[PDB]
Design a protein around this ligand. Structure first.
Ligand SMILES: Nc1ncnc2c1ncn2[C@@H]1O[C@H](COP(=O)(O)OP(=O)(O)NP(=O)(O)O)[C@@H](O)[C@H]1O
Ligand SMILES: [Mg+2]
Ligand SMILES: [Mg+2]
Length: 210
Protein backbone atom coordinates (compact mmCIF):
# COMPACT_ATOMS: atom_id res chain seq x y z
CA UNK A 1 0.00 0.00 0.00
CA UNK A 2 0.89 3.66 -0.49
CA UNK A 3 0.32 5.80 2.58
CA UNK A 4 2.26 8.84 1.37
CA UNK A 5 3.21 10.25 -2.03
CA UNK A 6 6.62 11.94 -2.19
CA UNK A 7 7.96 14.02 -5.05
CA UNK A 8 9.37 11.08 -7.00
CA UNK A 9 6.13 9.11 -6.76
CA UNK A 10 4.25 12.20 -8.00
CA UNK A 11 6.78 12.51 -10.83
CA UNK A 12 6.13 8.87 -11.74
CA UNK A 13 2.37 9.55 -11.74
CA UNK A 14 2.96 12.46 -14.12
CA UNK A 15 5.25 10.44 -16.39
CA UNK A 16 3.01 7.37 -16.58
CA UNK A 17 -0.13 9.52 -16.89
CA UNK A 18 1.51 11.38 -19.76
CA UNK A 19 2.55 8.14 -21.47
CA UNK A 20 -0.93 6.65 -21.16
CA UNK A 21 -2.47 9.81 -22.61
CA UNK A 22 0.06 9.77 -25.46
CA UNK A 23 -0.82 6.15 -26.24
CA UNK A 24 -4.51 7.12 -26.36
CA UNK A 25 -4.17 10.46 -28.14
CA UNK A 26 -5.52 9.16 -31.46
CA UNK A 27 -8.49 7.52 -29.70
CA UNK A 28 -9.26 10.77 -27.86
CA UNK A 29 -8.95 12.70 -31.14
CA UNK A 30 -11.45 10.30 -32.76
CA UNK A 31 -14.08 11.38 -30.23
CA UNK A 32 -13.70 15.17 -30.48
CA UNK A 33 -17.04 16.54 -31.68
CA UNK A 34 -17.51 19.48 -29.25
CA UNK A 35 -17.34 22.51 -29.34
CA UNK A 36 -16.15 22.08 -32.95
CA UNK A 37 -15.64 18.57 -34.37
CA UNK A 38 -12.01 19.24 -35.27
CA UNK A 39 -10.66 15.91 -34.01
CA UNK A 40 -7.78 17.29 -31.91
CA UNK A 41 -8.54 16.98 -28.18
CA UNK A 42 -6.10 14.11 -27.74
CA UNK A 43 -3.30 15.92 -29.53
CA UNK A 44 -3.98 19.12 -27.57
CA UNK A 45 -4.01 17.37 -24.20
CA UNK A 46 -0.99 15.23 -25.13
CA UNK A 47 1.08 18.27 -26.12
CA UNK A 48 0.10 20.06 -22.90
CA UNK A 49 0.82 17.07 -20.65
CA UNK A 50 4.10 16.42 -22.48
CA UNK A 51 5.27 19.96 -21.66
CA UNK A 52 4.61 19.26 -17.99
CA UNK A 53 6.28 15.84 -18.17
CA UNK A 54 9.41 17.23 -19.83
CA UNK A 55 9.86 19.88 -17.14
CA UNK A 56 9.45 17.22 -14.44
CA UNK A 57 11.90 14.75 -15.99
CA UNK A 58 14.54 17.49 -16.19
CA UNK A 59 13.98 18.72 -12.61
CA UNK A 60 13.10 15.86 -10.22
CA UNK A 61 12.74 16.38 -6.47
CA UNK A 62 12.01 14.32 -3.37
CA UNK A 63 9.70 17.18 -2.29
CA UNK A 64 6.21 16.91 -3.78
CA UNK A 65 5.46 20.63 -3.46
CA UNK A 66 8.57 21.60 -5.42
CA UNK A 67 7.91 18.92 -8.03
CA UNK A 68 4.38 20.24 -8.38
CA UNK A 69 5.67 23.76 -9.04
CA UNK A 70 7.80 22.32 -11.85
CA UNK A 71 4.89 20.34 -13.32
CA UNK A 72 2.48 23.29 -13.06
CA UNK A 73 4.89 25.65 -14.81
CA UNK A 74 5.43 23.17 -17.63
CA UNK A 75 1.71 22.70 -18.20
CA UNK A 76 0.89 26.40 -18.09
CA UNK A 77 3.45 27.46 -20.68
CA UNK A 78 2.54 24.58 -23.03
CA UNK A 79 -1.25 24.56 -22.77
CA UNK A 80 -2.94 23.87 -26.12
CA UNK A 81 -6.65 24.05 -26.94
CA UNK A 82 -9.65 24.30 -24.66
CA UNK A 83 -8.82 20.89 -23.23
CA UNK A 84 -5.14 21.61 -22.63
CA UNK A 85 -5.95 24.92 -20.98
CA UNK A 86 -8.47 23.22 -18.70
CA UNK A 87 -6.01 20.40 -17.93
CA UNK A 88 -3.34 22.95 -17.02
CA UNK A 89 -5.79 24.79 -14.73
CA UNK A 90 -6.91 21.57 -13.00
CA UNK A 91 -3.30 20.81 -12.20
CA UNK A 92 -2.43 24.41 -11.34
CA UNK A 93 -4.96 24.24 -8.51
CA UNK A 94 -3.92 20.71 -7.52
CA UNK A 95 -0.26 21.65 -7.26
CA UNK A 96 -0.88 25.00 -5.54
CA UNK A 97 -2.69 23.09 -2.80
CA UNK A 98 0.44 21.05 -1.98
CA UNK A 99 3.14 23.64 -2.67
CA UNK A 100 4.54 23.55 0.89
CA UNK A 101 4.41 19.76 1.40
CA UNK A 102 7.19 17.21 1.07
CA UNK A 103 4.74 14.28 0.78
CA UNK A 104 0.96 13.93 0.88
CA UNK A 105 -1.50 11.38 2.27
CA UNK A 106 -4.73 10.13 0.71
CA UNK A 107 -6.86 12.89 2.24
CA UNK A 108 -4.58 15.62 0.87
CA UNK A 109 -4.52 13.88 -2.53
CA UNK A 110 -8.32 14.06 -2.58
CA UNK A 111 -8.35 17.68 -1.40
CA UNK A 112 -5.88 18.57 -4.15
CA UNK A 113 -8.11 17.09 -6.85
CA UNK A 114 -10.94 19.23 -5.44
CA UNK A 115 -8.77 22.36 -5.41
CA UNK A 116 -8.01 21.73 -9.07
CA UNK A 117 -11.71 21.48 -9.90
CA UNK A 118 -12.32 24.84 -8.25
CA UNK A 119 -9.48 26.49 -10.17
CA UNK A 120 -10.62 25.07 -13.51
CA UNK A 121 -14.29 26.03 -13.07
CA UNK A 122 -13.26 29.59 -12.17
CA UNK A 123 -10.95 29.77 -15.22
CA UNK A 124 -13.72 28.94 -17.74
CA UNK A 125 -16.02 31.91 -18.30
CA UNK A 126 -19.00 29.76 -19.39
CA UNK A 127 -18.62 26.20 -18.08
CA UNK A 128 -20.71 23.53 -19.81
CA UNK A 129 -21.64 20.22 -18.16
CA UNK A 130 -20.97 16.87 -19.79
CA UNK A 131 -17.31 17.73 -20.21
CA UNK A 132 -13.84 17.41 -18.69
CA UNK A 133 -15.04 19.77 -15.92
CA UNK A 134 -17.88 17.42 -14.97
CA UNK A 135 -15.63 14.36 -14.95
CA UNK A 136 -13.01 16.13 -12.83
CA UNK A 137 -15.70 17.38 -10.42
CA UNK A 138 -17.27 13.94 -9.98
CA UNK A 139 -13.84 12.33 -9.59
CA UNK A 140 -12.85 14.80 -6.86
CA UNK A 141 -16.10 14.37 -4.94
CA UNK A 142 -15.55 10.62 -5.00
CA UNK A 143 -11.95 11.12 -3.86
CA UNK A 144 -13.00 13.17 -0.83
CA UNK A 145 -15.67 10.69 0.22
CA UNK A 146 -13.40 7.66 -0.12
CA UNK A 147 -10.24 9.15 1.38
CA UNK A 148 -12.06 9.83 4.63
CA UNK A 149 -11.86 6.07 5.37
CA UNK A 150 -9.11 4.87 2.99
CA UNK A 151 -5.44 5.40 3.85
CA UNK A 152 -4.13 3.47 0.82
CA UNK A 153 -3.62 5.79 -2.15
CA UNK A 154 -3.81 2.81 -4.55
CA UNK A 155 -7.28 1.84 -3.32
CA UNK A 156 -8.27 5.51 -3.36
CA UNK A 157 -7.08 6.04 -6.94
CA UNK A 158 -8.84 2.86 -8.08
CA UNK A 159 -12.10 4.23 -6.68
CA UNK A 160 -11.54 7.65 -8.24
CA UNK A 161 -11.13 5.92 -11.61
CA UNK A 162 -14.32 3.87 -11.16
CA UNK A 163 -16.30 7.01 -10.36
CA UNK A 164 -14.60 9.13 -13.03
CA UNK A 165 -15.50 6.47 -15.60
CA UNK A 166 -19.13 6.49 -14.42
CA UNK A 167 -19.15 10.27 -14.86
CA UNK A 168 -17.56 9.98 -18.30
CA UNK A 169 -20.15 7.43 -19.40
CA UNK A 170 -22.84 9.86 -18.22
CA UNK A 171 -21.52 12.82 -20.25
CA UNK A 172 -23.90 12.13 -23.20
CA UNK A 173 -26.83 12.56 -20.80
CA UNK A 174 -25.73 16.15 -20.12
CA UNK A 175 -24.44 17.37 -23.52
CA UNK A 176 -26.79 16.68 -26.43
CA UNK A 177 -24.24 16.49 -29.25
CA UNK A 178 -22.45 13.62 -27.49
CA UNK A 179 -25.64 11.54 -27.36
CA UNK A 180 -26.66 12.46 -30.91
CA UNK A 181 -23.28 11.53 -32.38
CA UNK A 182 -22.77 8.55 -30.05
CA UNK A 183 -19.55 9.40 -28.16
CA UNK A 184 -18.45 10.28 -24.65
CA UNK A 185 -16.68 13.58 -24.03
CA UNK A 186 -13.17 13.67 -25.48
CA UNK A 187 -11.72 15.96 -22.81
CA UNK A 188 -13.06 13.71 -20.09
CA UNK A 189 -11.65 10.64 -21.83
CA UNK A 190 -8.22 12.28 -21.97
CA UNK A 191 -8.42 13.06 -18.25
CA UNK A 192 -9.30 9.43 -17.52
CA UNK A 193 -6.22 8.33 -19.45
CA UNK A 194 -4.05 10.52 -17.22
CA UNK A 195 -5.70 9.10 -14.09
CA UNK A 196 -5.17 5.52 -15.29
CA UNK A 197 -1.47 6.29 -15.59
CA UNK A 198 -1.47 7.79 -12.10
CA UNK A 199 -2.73 4.42 -10.82
CA UNK A 200 -0.02 2.48 -12.67
CA UNK A 201 2.64 4.66 -11.05
CA UNK A 202 1.13 4.25 -7.57
CA UNK A 203 1.41 0.47 -8.10
CA UNK A 204 5.08 0.81 -9.11
CA UNK A 205 4.27 -0.14 -12.71
CA UNK A 206 5.10 1.34 -16.08
CA UNK A 207 2.88 2.16 -19.05
CA UNK A 208 4.25 0.49 -22.18
CA UNK A 209 5.06 3.09 -24.83
CA UNK A 210 3.20 2.73 -28.14
N1 LIG B 1 -17.17 25.60 -21.98
C1 LIG B 1 -16.61 24.43 -21.67
N2 LIG B 1 -16.83 23.91 -20.45
C2 LIG B 1 -16.27 22.74 -20.13
N3 LIG B 1 -15.47 21.97 -20.86
C3 LIG B 1 -15.28 22.50 -22.08
C4 LIG B 1 -15.79 23.69 -22.55
N4 LIG B 1 -15.37 23.93 -23.86
C5 LIG B 1 -14.64 22.87 -24.14
N5 LIG B 1 -14.53 21.98 -23.10
C6 LIG B 1 -13.81 20.72 -23.06
O1 LIG B 1 -12.83 20.73 -24.09
C7 LIG B 1 -12.98 19.56 -24.91
C8 LIG B 1 -12.58 19.91 -26.32
O2 LIG B 1 -11.20 20.27 -26.30
P1 LIG B 1 -10.39 20.69 -27.57
O3 LIG B 1 -10.72 19.77 -28.69
O4 LIG B 1 -8.94 20.83 -27.15
O5 LIG B 1 -11.00 22.13 -27.90
P2 LIG B 1 -10.57 23.05 -29.14
O6 LIG B 1 -10.49 22.17 -30.39
O7 LIG B 1 -9.26 23.71 -28.75
N6 LIG B 1 -11.74 24.22 -29.25
P3 LIG B 1 -12.92 24.26 -30.43
O8 LIG B 1 -12.23 24.25 -31.85
O9 LIG B 1 -13.60 25.65 -30.19
O10 LIG B 1 -13.82 23.07 -30.32
C9 LIG B 1 -14.43 19.13 -24.73
O11 LIG B 1 -14.59 17.77 -25.08
C10 LIG B 1 -14.68 19.47 -23.26
O12 LIG B 1 -14.14 18.47 -22.40
MG1 LIG C 1 -9.10 23.17 -32.33
MG1 LIG D 1 -11.01 20.19 -30.72
Amino acid sequence: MISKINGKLFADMIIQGAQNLSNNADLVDSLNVYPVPDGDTGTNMNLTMTSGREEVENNLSKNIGELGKTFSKGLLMGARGNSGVILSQLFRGFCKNIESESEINSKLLAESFQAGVETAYKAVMKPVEGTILTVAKDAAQAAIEKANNTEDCIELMEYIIVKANESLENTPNLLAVLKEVGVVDSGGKGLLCVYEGFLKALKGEKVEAK
